[PDB]
Design a protein around this ligand. Structure first.
Ligand SMILES: CC(=O)SCCNC(=O)CCNC(=O)[C@H](O)C(C)(C)COP(=O)(O)OP(=O)(O)OC[C@H]1O[C@@H](n2cnc3c(N)ncnc32)[C@H](O)[C@@H]1OP(=O)(O)O
Ligand SMILES: CC(=O)SCCNC(=O)CCNC(=O)[C@H](O)C(C)(C)COP(=O)(O)OP(=O)(O)OC[C@H]1O[C@@H](n2cnc3c(N)ncnc32)[C@H](O)[C@@H]1OP(=O)(O)O
Ligand SMILES: [K+]
Ligand SMILES: [K+]
Lengths: 176, 176
């Protein structure tokens, strides 16, 4: 069965092309309730398109006290990975989680998250967090299934790259 | 009169103790309108207390392509400074702006912001941004007077440091 383990220098050249692309078919619409500052959302369909999530240099995460990469291995091949760092607020921060396109929805991502939680706890980190865009509904639903909640959002940060679009950053948190 | 110029190595030992403390006397209460995703706020008084804004190592900002420190000089003394970097979204990012307590409300901060805008433009940066806490109403009003608008907020990021309090991060933006 599937194995999740820490990335090693010797894995760097055996690292295959992993398809991190996904289909954007909808977007989250955010709202702020007056009850417990709860950020809520509704889903709105948008004309579909494909995009790649992704600079990430794997070697920068090998042999480091506060950052690490875990890889998912199935039938002698790396089929997914998770990139983690310790953030300024003490939480573990997911820089990137990717499962090869052909193997998604089969529980690999949840197993990567479970390992990330172990790493966070081993380092005395009180939770895990990450940022995603409101047009990555697949990822949003995945984090929600994993126990994460929306703690914040930002309507202007993406304008610095492109002023035409209306991409929104969403910040997700899982507290232990 | 006042002089604003780039920090030099030779200024490092002539750098005096600058009082960056401020009095917290209120906090911003955020809301999200349905019109143009406008984030609004109201001010609520809170029992007052003093806190220091501030690791920042000035030497890390000397002789760098994408980061810099400008100092404010008055009567042979450094009375304020602004710390800037280029962010991932291309905006100039204010890591810290401080005017010595005794000289506040006399226009020094606005002059530091003006210089930061020049630096941003010289580097082809499309705007300037920063993060502050909802309990720093003085800073919030100052940014608002300087033309900044609220682009986002986060209710959980501060929980990683302290779970008892309810500090909220506010992200401000000035687009050119
Ligand atoms: C910080 C960041 O990295 S943000 C970017 C995240 N990465 C990407 O978007 C790259 C492309 N996407 C992917 O690689 C994958 O879709 C991942 C990593 C997000 C998820 O990995 P997967 O292995 O597919 O997730 P997994 O099968 O473990 O799903 C776990 C749960 O989430 C749910 N889920 C997963 N994908 C979806 C989806 N597209 N829509 C709805 N629910 C979903 C599953 O149904 C499952 O729920 P359950 O526990 O109730 O059965
Ligand atoms: C990213 C970060 O650094 S967030 C932390 C910001 N830094 C701090 O909080 C450190 C402590 N505070 C300070 O150092 C100063 O208060 C600063 C840097 C925020 C502002 O510097 P100052 O030199 O006092 O500001 P300056 O006098 O230029 O004020 C410019 C405008 O803002 C307004 N303003 C300044 N302080 C306040 C205040 N406390 N309340 C209301 N309005 C204010 C001024 O009235 C002025 O408005 P005008 O142009 O309409 O006359
Ligand atoms: K995303
Ligand atoms: K602040």
């Amino acid at each position: 069965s599937l194995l999740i383990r820490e990335l090693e220098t010797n894995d760097l050249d055996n690292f295959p092309e992993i398809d991190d692309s996904f289909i954007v078919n909808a977007r989250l619409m955010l709202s702020l309730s007056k009850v417990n500052r709860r950020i809520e959302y509704t889903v709105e369909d948008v004309p579909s398109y494909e995009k790649s999530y992704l600079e990430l240099v794997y070697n920068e995460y090998i042999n480091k006290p506060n950052q690490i990469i875990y890889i998912a291995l199935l039938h002698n091949q790396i089929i997914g990975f998770i990139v983690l760092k310790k953030n300024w607020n003490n939480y573990a921060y997911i820089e990137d989680i990717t499962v090869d396109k052909k193997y998604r929805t089969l529980g690999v991502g949840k197993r990567l998250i479970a390992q990330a939680k172990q790493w966070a706890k081993e380092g005395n980190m009180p939770g895990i967090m990450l940022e995603t865009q409101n047009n990555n509904v697949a990822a949003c639903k995945f984090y929600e299934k994993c126990g994460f909640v929306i703690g914040g959002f930002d309507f202007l940060v993406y304008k610095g790259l492109n002023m035409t679009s209306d991409e929104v950053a969403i910040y997700w948190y899982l507290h232990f």
